[PDB]
Subunit: 119 residues, 3 copies
């Protein structure tokens, strides 16, 4: 059964503006340790962050819990996946979450994501 | 089992332009009585209407099109967006055996989007 | 259970730009025979292709292949459905896909689509 559903859309220019004003602050707040390491060497880190933000916001909505607790990674097939930390992980176990489905897309100006959590 | 799936994207400026040209007409057709009352006094009414359009269009698609005013959006006691169905849409959900409706929406400066899944 | 989830957003002006470069060659690539026939006489071929593109990319993400293997058609009622060919059809049979849920939307500047495949 579906236990939760979330979506988000992110204007990439909005994230760019935050970075211009705050520097690394946003990424340090919302990225897990593994994601931070990617951020540091990424060729397009603003785009990377905006896409991560979209997924994390979609995940947070699906679960109804800081953004750095919703880690996005790509599995052995190259498919985007969620790995939970801390309170988010405890909530997942509490809710009886068995599967988590993640998708994201980006165009030049916008990134989008949808997350479904399932028993 | 999933019984239906719908999505929509709404350019807020389009809603703004229609309201500028014909005022209340757009809102009157698609809003329930409760939603109309909110529309009339909302601090950001164009954004309110745009976001309502995204959810209603997504819902209508999920139900496999139904009048938008029969897909009432409300926030529950925890503040989460939910559907309240009326008339033909309510009877349809009963006939389809809908047990669960899942609604999500998002908005940026220029666009709102929404996805609805209905489930047995 | 949900077997896969995909989403896409397509900037229509980008598709228009691709068509300016290579004419009908993109359509030749991503469209099945049935879609190609519709393309030839469409009133708005750019929009048609952009919308097809969004659905096809979302479907490919849901399955985790080629775009011409994910045919979009309208059923007797008028709602979008997927018809699979070649490798896509074989993969669906392997995964035991029972239902394929498709939705799409378009604004002036963007098309979007979400696909859910189910057991
Ligand atoms: Cl407004
Ligand atoms: Cl209507
Ligand atoms: Cl066109």
């Amino acid at each position: 059964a579906i236990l939760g559903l979330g979506t988000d859309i992110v204007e990439i220019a909005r994230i760019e503006a935050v970075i211009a004003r705050s520097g690394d602050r946003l990424a340090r707040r919302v990225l897990s340790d593994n994601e931070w390491a990617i951020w540091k060497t990424h060729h397009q880190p603003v785009r990377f962050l905006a896409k991560r933000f979209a997924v994390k916001e979609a995940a947070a909505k699906a679960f109804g819990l800081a953004f750095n607790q919703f880690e996005v990674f790509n599995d052995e097939l190259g498919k985007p996946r969620l790995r939970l930390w801390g309170e988010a992980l405890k909530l997942a176990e509490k809710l009886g979450v068995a599967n988590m489905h993640v998708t994201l897309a980006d165009e030049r100006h916008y990134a989008c994501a949808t997350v479904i959590i399932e028993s």
